[PDB]
Amino acid sequence: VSKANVPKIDVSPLFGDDQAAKMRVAQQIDAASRDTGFFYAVNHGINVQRLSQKTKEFHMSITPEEKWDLAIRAYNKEHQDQVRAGYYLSIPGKKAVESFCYLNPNFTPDHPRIQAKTPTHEVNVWPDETKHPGFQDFAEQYYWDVFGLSSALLKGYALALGKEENFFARHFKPDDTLASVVLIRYPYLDPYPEAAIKTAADGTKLSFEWHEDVSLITVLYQSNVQNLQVETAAGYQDIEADDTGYLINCGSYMAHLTNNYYKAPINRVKWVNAERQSLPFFVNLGYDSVIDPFDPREPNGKSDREPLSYGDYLQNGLVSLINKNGQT
Ligand SMILES: CC(C)[C@@H](NC(=O)[C@H](CS)NC(=O)CCC[C@H](N)C(=O)O)C(=O)O
Numbered sequence: 400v401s402k403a404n405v406p407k408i409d410v411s412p413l414f415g416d417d418q419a420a421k422m423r424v425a426q427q428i429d430a431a432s433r434d435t436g437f438f439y440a441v442n443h444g445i446n447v448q449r450l451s452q453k454t455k456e457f458h459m460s461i462t463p464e465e466k467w468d469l470a471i472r473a474y475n476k477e478h479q480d481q482v483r484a485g486y487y488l489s490i491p492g493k494k495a496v497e498s499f500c501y502l503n504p505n506f507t508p509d510h511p512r513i514q515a516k517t518p519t520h521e522v523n524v525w526p527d528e529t530k531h532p533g534f535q536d537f538a539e540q541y542y543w544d545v546f547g548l549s550s551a552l553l554k555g556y557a558l559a560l561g562k563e564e565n566f567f568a569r570h571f572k573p574d575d576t577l578a579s580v581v582l583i584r585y586p587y588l589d590p591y592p593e594a595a596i597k598t599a600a601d602g603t604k605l606s607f608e609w610h611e612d613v614s615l616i617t618v619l620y621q622s623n624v625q626n627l628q629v630e631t632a633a634g635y636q637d638i639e640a641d642d643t644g645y646l647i648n649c650g651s652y653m654a655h656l657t658n659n660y661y662k663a664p665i666n667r668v669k670w671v672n673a674e675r676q677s678l679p680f681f682v683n684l685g686y687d688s689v690i691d692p693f694d695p696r697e698p699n700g701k702s703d704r705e706p707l708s709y710g711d712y713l714q715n716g717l718v719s720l721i722n723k724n725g726q727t
């Protein structure tokens with residue numbers, strides 16, 4: 400098994416006003432997006448030490464009672480509105496992974512999309528404050544911190560594609576974003592449940608099978624345990640861990656709108672028997688966001704692909720991913 404080329408890109412110029420320096424970051428994003436599809440964003444300004452500490456404190460203290468009370472509909476029939484947000488339970492002996500997903504904190508009962516019952520919009524559920532002091536405040540603050548980094552990254556992707564820097568970010572707004580955070584715990588288990596280990600076609604033991612990401616881009620922090628692989632024509636390559644950087648890649652919405660010029664890399668999660676954290680932020684636009692496709696390979700830039708509404712894309716992508724790779 401070879402190792403993927405995953406460059407470490409200093410993204411700090413994307414927060415500034417040095418336009419030429421931003422173009423030099425964009426060039427690196429372009430190069431990575433045309434190669435394996437992944438890069439590490441470094442010098443990003445997020446305190447990832449506190450992110451990992453606060454996330455660990457939550458995973459390691461929530462009780463079974465609290466998990467039922469927060470559980471998504473797949474684990475608790477009483478919670479028919481929780482298709483996305485809430486707790487995703489492990490199944491001892493069968494399923495090792497567990498996680499907590501939350502959405503835009505601005506999705507309240509006031510919100511027009513909640514009042515209209517538009518799919519993919521939900522009001523977040525939270526544990527008891529006294530049982531988890533500071534957790535909700537940390538998690539909401541983190542949502543906006545990673546939103547800020549993601550907006551910067553989107554300026555880099557726009558410039559990389561020959562567009563003005565707001566081409567993506569203009570659709571990425573705090574009032575309507577469908578972006579999500581998932582706080583995933585992959586546990587150490589001895590013995591490890593065989594049912595929680597899948598065997599790939601190439602014989603590799605996996606915790607999550609091959610897929611393209613359902614996102615515009617994915618902005619991922621993981622603890623320092625190597626696990627991810629990306630598919631190339633020459634086979635799967637290992638993505639090295641870097642618990643100081645954010646692992647970035649394009650999702651299938653980007654592949655659609657660029658006429659596959661920036662592909663959505665196929666990736667999978669190797670089985671590793673080690674306690675670790677996986678904390679993705681899925682950069683999703685608003686429900687009615689439509690980006691007009693283009694083809695950077697063509698002199699005239701024209702694409703014949705249909706503009707896709709982001710909400711319909713997300714609803715179908717999340718359902719399909721559950722159908723293909725299982726309820727997480
Ligand atoms: C590879 C990581 C991103 C992570 N995998 C994942 O998070 C996988 C593959 S991208 N993603 C999903 O299952 C989609 C979760 C969407 C979320 N419930 C929501 O409502 O928005 C892992 O560690 O398994």
Ligand SMILES: [Fe+3]
Binds near residue numbers: 610611
């Ligand atoms: Fe993925």
